[model samples]
Target: ASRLYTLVLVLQPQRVLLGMKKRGFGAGRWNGFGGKVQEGETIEDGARRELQEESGLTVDALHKVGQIVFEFVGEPELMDVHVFCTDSIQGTPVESDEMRPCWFQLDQIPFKDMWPDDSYWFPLLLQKKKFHGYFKFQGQDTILDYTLREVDTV
Candidate 1:
């Protein structure tokens, strides 16, 4: 399994800034804040580490939001994505060699600078909703197979 993690950060009201990775798999695109689970690191540990390493913030509280599994034909690997959210954190976000953090207003997100499938479900996430999605992408063309679920209600 190709293990990965994502952290959604709410920097301000109606504004969310995701750390944009400048290298590796999805290079030059803006996405959530995270990276691969390093050796001997738990998923949560990886999430926390990534947040600090990529954005210079230390997460105070993190909750598992959802997960995604993508199987690509003709590839030997299956991607496993873990989603996380933290309402508790400290410090300021900054740009690192691996990532450059940028804020986006709810109405002015740089959708065109992200993965093609992000716009489909990220809005739900921004609304504090939970979601699970399976994306099939072939060179930037994507098809999203997903389900959205509500959160934080009795």
Candidate 2:
């Protein structure tokens, strides 16, 4: 098994929620808010908590939209991440210690400032469908290869 992480995209009208990482892995990038799944919490719980912690948005309803397993070349461990989509968020989005919250139009996402692999799966999220994939990364910024597909269910 791999270390699990959860990413949530708060959907808006032709826009989605994203955050600028302040520290740690993926710092200096723009992406959804999420992190390690806790010991006993469900994956969905982890996603909700991270979203609230990083962006101050409490998600009452979320849909499991995607999943990805990221195996970095030469790395001993991998990341099994769940991607969620939700439009039922409450509270105001504000910057937290870990990230800076921002709303991005679908056509205006700063892909250059995010993980290269994100460009592959993000469109699946916006398509409002379920997806699954596995990515092989040469490093933090390089995608060696990947498999992504839109699915009937996650």
Candidate 3:
């Protein structure tokens, strides 16, 4: 079975806001704020909810930029993640039980502390291009195989 997830990246003029996942699956990594899409909520709504819940920021609009599916060796479920970005924000980000919020310069994204697959697709996202990708992982540190390409629509 596949699980639906939402990831939202908040952008400022020359930097992007990210959070250090404090616990659970992606803990210790610097990444966008997001989590599983809950039942009864639209995907974009779920995206906004997670961003607010994790980072304490409210966003009015989320631009869908990419979608990625991830599979790990021997794992039964697939992670189907919808990626979004927005520059319009309504509140200052604060630390949450789930995340420690921080900002990083666009050119200085802490890739090494982020999910490995991000490096491949982040460039496309930064360019505001729509795209889709599938990543097969051998555990968390290595990508065994993958396919990513820009798209006219995700």
Candidate 4:
């Protein structure tokens, strides 16, 4: 099976909840909440489960924002990334065994530890604009190419 990651954009007044991987694959990297989809689980279910697991919160009023798909060099299969946005949730965010939950101010995100492409379109999303983006990266440090489209009423 191919690998998939989900990113949940949990918005608050002055900051947003983000999780940091503590061990295994993406250790020490700040990322949105998500994991590989389990058998028999829909993408929405997976996203919800991940948000709960990583952030210690229950998400409600969740909606799909957009998706990104790309092929990693040397890998035969492509990676599918689904993005979701939520303004409703219960419980406070906490660090779990796999992830450390944290909040970033609207204009003060830790971009150095996140995916390079995040800096490109996150601002638009914060402004309540819908966006779809894709990126092809060569390893973790090099971005080969990328694209973004904003869809929101002006």
Best by TM-score: 3
Alpha carbon lDDT at 30, candidate 4: 87
Q: Write the per-residue lDDT of candidate 1 for residues 55-91, one digit (tens) a residue.
A: 8888867777667666555566767787787766788
Candidate 1 or 3, higher TM-score?
3
Q: lDDT per residue, candidate 4, 1-154, as tens digits?
A: 3577777889777888888899876687888888778888888999999889888899867787767666567777677888888888999888778888888898888889987788887777687777767777787777798888875521
Give the alpha carbon lDDT tens digit for every residue of 1-154 in model 2: 5899999889877888889998999999999888999999999999999888889888888899999999999988889999998988888889878898888988998999999988888887787878899999987988888999889989
Output the worst ten-in-a-row residue range by lDDT, candidate 4: 145-154
Count of steric clashes across candidates, in order: 0, 0, 0, 0
Ranking by lDDT: 3, 2, 4, 1
Q: Candidate 4, residue 118: CA error in Å? A: 0.6
What candidate 4 gets wrong by more than 4 Å, as runs, is 1-3, 152-154
* Cα misplacement distance, residue 70 of candidate 4 (Å): 3.3
Instruction: Write out the backbone clash pairs for model 4.
Output: none
- What Cα-based lDDT does every candidate model obtain? 0.72, 0.89, 0.92, 0.80
TM-score, every prediction: 0.83, 0.96, 0.97, 0.89
Our model 4 lands, by Cα RMSD against the true structure, at 2.5
Write one digit per residue (lDDT tens) for candidate 3, span 65-100.
Answer: 999999999999999999999999998999878889
lDDT, residue 148, candidate 4: 81
**Candidate 2 at residue 59, lDDT?**
87
Best by lDDT: 3
Deviation (Å) of 64 in candidate 1 = 1.9
The reply for model 3, stretches above 4 Å from the true place, is none
